[PDB]
Design an enzyme around this catalytic site. Sequence first.
Site, PDB file in Angstrom:
ATOM      1  N   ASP A 143     -26.003 -45.444  36.870  1.00  0.00           N
ATOM      2  CA  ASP A 143     -24.642 -44.968  36.645  1.00  0.00           C
ATOM      3  C   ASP A 143     -24.721 -43.794  35.675  1.00  0.00           C
ATOM      4  OD1 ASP A 143     -21.959 -44.509  36.120  1.00  0.00           O
ATOM      5  OD2 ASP A 143     -21.443 -46.636  35.983  1.00  0.00           O
ATOM      6  N   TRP A 154     -19.565 -51.259  30.831  1.00  0.00           N
ATOM      7  CA  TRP A 154     -18.238 -50.852  31.268  1.00  0.00           C
ATOM      8  C   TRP A 154     -17.548 -52.043  31.927  1.00  0.00           C
ATOM      9  CZ3 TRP A 154     -16.472 -48.151  36.221  1.00  0.00           C
ATOM     10  CH2 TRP A 154     -15.224 -47.544  36.030  1.00  0.00           C
ATOM     11  N   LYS A 192     -15.988 -36.561  33.254  1.00  0.00           N
ATOM     12  CA  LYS A 192     -16.101 -36.336  31.819  1.00  0.00           C
ATOM     13  C   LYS A 192     -16.651 -34.947  31.511  1.00  0.00           C
ATOM     14  CE  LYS A 192     -15.457 -40.921  31.577  1.00  0.00           C
ATOM     15  NZ  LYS A 192     -14.146 -41.546  31.255  1.00  0.00           N
TER      16      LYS A 192
HETATM   17  C1  LIG Z   1     -20.365 -45.934  32.553  1.00  0.00           C
HETATM   18  C2  LIG Z   1     -19.256 -45.459  33.445  1.00  0.00           C
HETATM   19  N1  LIG Z   1     -19.418 -45.506  34.811  1.00  0.00           N
HETATM   20  C3  LIG Z   1     -18.406 -45.069  35.637  1.00  0.00           C
HETATM   21  C4  LIG Z   1     -17.216 -44.581  35.108  1.00  0.00           C
HETATM   22  C5  LIG Z   1     -16.172 -44.133  36.104  1.00  0.00           C
HETATM   23  O1  LIG Z   1     -15.775 -42.802  35.884  1.00  0.00           O
HETATM   24  P1  LIG Z   1     -14.745 -42.110  36.907  1.00  0.00           P
HETATM   25  O2  LIG Z   1     -13.473 -41.824  36.147  1.00  0.00           O
HETATM   26  O3  LIG Z   1     -15.320 -40.828  37.457  1.00  0.00           O
HETATM   27  O4  LIG Z   1     -14.433 -43.068  38.036  1.00  0.00           O
HETATM   28  C6  LIG Z   1     -17.034 -44.526  33.720  1.00  0.00           C
HETATM   29  C7  LIG Z   1     -15.757 -44.038  33.078  1.00  0.00           C
HETATM   30  O5  LIG Z   1     -14.748 -43.850  33.752  1.00  0.00           O
HETATM   31  C8  LIG Z   1     -18.074 -44.969  32.899  1.00  0.00           C
HETATM   32  O6  LIG Z   1     -17.947 -44.946  31.534  1.00  0.00           O
END
Ligand SMILES: Cc1ncc(COP(=O)(O)O)c(C=O)c1O
Lengths: 397, 397
Positions: free
Chosen positions: B212, B131, B247
């Site tokens: 994560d 990410w 999600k």
């Molecule tokens: C691997 C990963 N970690 C963290 C996040 C952060 O998600 P959030 O929208 O809840 O901050 C995402 C996507 O947003 C993600 O794909």
Amino acid sequence: GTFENITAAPADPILGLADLFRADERPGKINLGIGVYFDETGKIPVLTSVKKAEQYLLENETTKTYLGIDGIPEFGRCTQELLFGKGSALINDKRARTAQTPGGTGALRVAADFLAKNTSVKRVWVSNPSWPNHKSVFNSAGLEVREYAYYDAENHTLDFDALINSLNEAQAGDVVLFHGCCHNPTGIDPTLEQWQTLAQLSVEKGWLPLFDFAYQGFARGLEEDAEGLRAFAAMHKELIVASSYSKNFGLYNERVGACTLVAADSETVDRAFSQMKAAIRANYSNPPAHGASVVATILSNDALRAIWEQELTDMRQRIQRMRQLFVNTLQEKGANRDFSFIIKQNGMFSFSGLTKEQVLRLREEFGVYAVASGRVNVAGMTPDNMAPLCEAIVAVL
Amino acid sequence: GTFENITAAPADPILGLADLFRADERPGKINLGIGVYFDETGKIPVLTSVKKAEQYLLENETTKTYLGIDGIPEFGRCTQELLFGKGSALINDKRARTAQTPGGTGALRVAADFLAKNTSVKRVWVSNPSWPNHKSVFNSAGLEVREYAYYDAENHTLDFDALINSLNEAQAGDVVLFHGCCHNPTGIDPTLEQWQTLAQLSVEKGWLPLFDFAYQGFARGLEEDAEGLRAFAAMHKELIVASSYSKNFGLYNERVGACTLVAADSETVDRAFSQMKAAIRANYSNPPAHGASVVATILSNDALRAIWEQELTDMRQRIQRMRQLFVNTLQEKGANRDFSFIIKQNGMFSFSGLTKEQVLRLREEFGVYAVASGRVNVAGMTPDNMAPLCEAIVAVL
Ligand SMILES: Cc1ncc(COP(=O)(O)O)c(C=O)c1O
Ligand SMILES: Cc1ncc(COP(=O)(O)O)c(C=O)c1O
């Protein structure tokens, strides 16, 4: 072990108090600690305008997809009008950009990270006393925090002479933090004339002003409470405003705030704002929608706005009546110390002048909870708890 | 002037792409960038479980008073059970403490701030690719980011040998970040045996694992997707989990996440958790309530949870049908390259293999928006847009 060498953190001077209060099993406790508004019933209600707006959102929301980094656009626009005026030159010249943030604390943190990483700012000047979390927020970004004098604990007034002298060593490029209104914890604000004096001195010395607005509408009114800020806005090229809707909308736990950036022209502020968005992206990515959607709905709808403004007037006026009743009941209960300065102070809080030892006595002997600095939440006083409260204070004087 | 010499920040590789898409005026544009779920209709809906929970909240919420620094307790309890299972020893030993955070991003920043300010950690290891915002979050807390190998572009598979030779350079006390499931952007996750291999290697080398967890339930199932984390949890004394409900609940803009801290014993985790609450206090004070209240209401009610589990299952399976439909449709539109590897990838995303120039061509000429790395959101594909999408891809091969 990575976590073995960790030193425990001290209890928060405000939130640690609320933990001791929830544990206390004695009947008749009185919570004058955290800065929330209580009604005459002793409860922390949801405003009618907020419930109306939440119903509209429940029925009309079709998606929860991510907001932009800077949040709801209408939220930022209504915020700038609230702070600067409906027809401000700042807005017409596109000199201001606003990011929606999680509460006033998040707005201060976003500003701190933005300054620490994109400017030569190394020092922030904060009033002594102030909100305890101010130092922690700016320290978390690596910024040194100095303190300037503010309160005349003898005359229970603003020590303007000491304030001016103590800020003599604030250099050009230093940040000076000002409470926009309802100074926390003293409840003593600069007069319009003192604001204008500070504005002139700020431009001559080259300070970067940072205004913290957590109680707009709790002193005199929405427009009157912003006179100090607008006196600064008329003279400065650059300034930062951290605002909060936790108090004046009763949306504490929804974390609704705004960080507004002002620069010399639209091109400069857009350039700086792009770095502020970068600091938001690396913190929480994008802000929570529900609370800000409520605020934007109310402020955009003329009918809901009129409801909210009357609810805010009701909150402000109840607090002012509790100030008067507090002073009168102290006399009736036999206090020889004069507490009439209370009626001069604005907002939710007032420096009672009690020593840390007397605050400790009230909590352990009488179940009355206040912050160890003597700060009491006047909005926590009701006609039902006023007499026991005053009897306890008189007992420790 | 403090802001005059600030440099403009570059656009976010994901959210900057979303702004271009909104501005594009062509009617046939297709958005395969941001990681949000679309239904067959092409909208980003609100789950029925969420709408029902929001209706309950609207009618039963009596206050918006601040939550504790760590948020709703039931939210933390239900989060730990999802991660570790009902009768986990970590939960019964009271070795785990969870703080409610604004989204998964917020959980990452809280952990990063907590580590940089209270431990000797100076280095975080992140998969290559990963990410994009992972680097920004950890750098902004002042931590160094190192990269370990992960993806075999030739075979479109996990290069478990390169992953190991890379992580042998990781010292004890370093933090190694793992995607719990549905690796972003590759969609290739370790097998249960590869997890157990990394787990043993982790305890042997003295790494501090940081998981994560943003897509629990999108690979195989709620329990199956946590197998890798639970293999680590059975061996380590310390680890950190940053999880997100954006999600799997479709609550993107309400910012609902959690940061779970695990230590060797209850006394150590509470000691460490006190400093984590301090880092939260100096960031946003306390977390937004609406999103986490929805999650806790759904998981606490058996009727609502059953609805949500079925809605999540439907999401997971629609994405699996689009993967199949996508591969078959590409062959029908004249693609001579083999795209079978797309079927073996998990989650919302797939590493298409397109070059940056091909991705740029898809956007400019055909109005198809994908991340410059070639990552496409399969959940953005519908039966209606599949044919034009595949026709455009074939036209740039
Ligand atoms: C691997 C990963 N970690 C963290 C996040 C952060 O998600 P959030 O929208 O809840 O901050 C995402 C996507 O947003 C993600 O794909
Ligand atoms: C001066 C001041 N700034 C900021 C805050 C925090 O605002 P919020 O709860 O919206 O984060 C408060 C009250 O808590 C305050 O009194």
